[PDB]
Curated annotation (Swiss-Prot), chains A, B:
Its biological purpose: Possesses E3 ubiquitin-protein ligase in vitro.
Stretches assigned to the U-box domain: 4-78
Signal peptide: none
Protein species of origin: Oryza sativa subsp. japonica (Rice)
Protein name listed in UniProt: U-box domain-containing protein 12
Species classification: Eukaryota, Viridiplantae, Streptophyta, Embryophyta, Tracheophyta
Residues of the full protein shown: 227 to 303 of 611
Length: 80, 80
């Protein structure tokens, strides 16, 4: 039928399911890989609104991970 | 209906229902009110581990907001 994961468990930037959740200073959640490229590129601004960024953080997701684990169990499936 | 919400949404510190979570540099989520008291007290150690904190990070809630709204809708219950 139809089975789509909530946007909460998907990377907003790539709109794709991935196992690497990280959070920005603003509290936004994005894929770590994308951010590494973003920082590596030398970009010090938020891609979402093109606003300037004076601080970055490598804080990993916590509750998101726990929630996704429960989500998979409910469906009785494993992450791709 | 379910009168008990998942511990993920519940504040770990007081195990009480609230809507104002923030993150810590250690990837821990605590209620905003509690951390404010901590700062006011001039404490420099993590309450749970009683270990010194060389630094701290303040990040407002994020994906929790979306989940909270959806959760209430699923149960058809108003959020206190």
């Amino acid at each position: 039928g139809a089975m789509i994961i909530p946007d909460e468990f998907r990377c907003p930037i790539d709109l794709e399911l991935m196992q690497d959740p990280v959070i920005v200073s603003s509290g936004q959640t994005y894929e770590r890989s994308c951010i590494q490229k973003w920082l590596d590129s030398g970009h010090k601004t938020c891609p979402k609104t093109q606003q300037p960024l004076s601080h970055t953080s490598l804080t990993p997701n916590f509750v998101l991970k726990s929630l996704i684990s429960q989500w998979c169990e409910a469906n009785g499936i494993e992450l791709p």
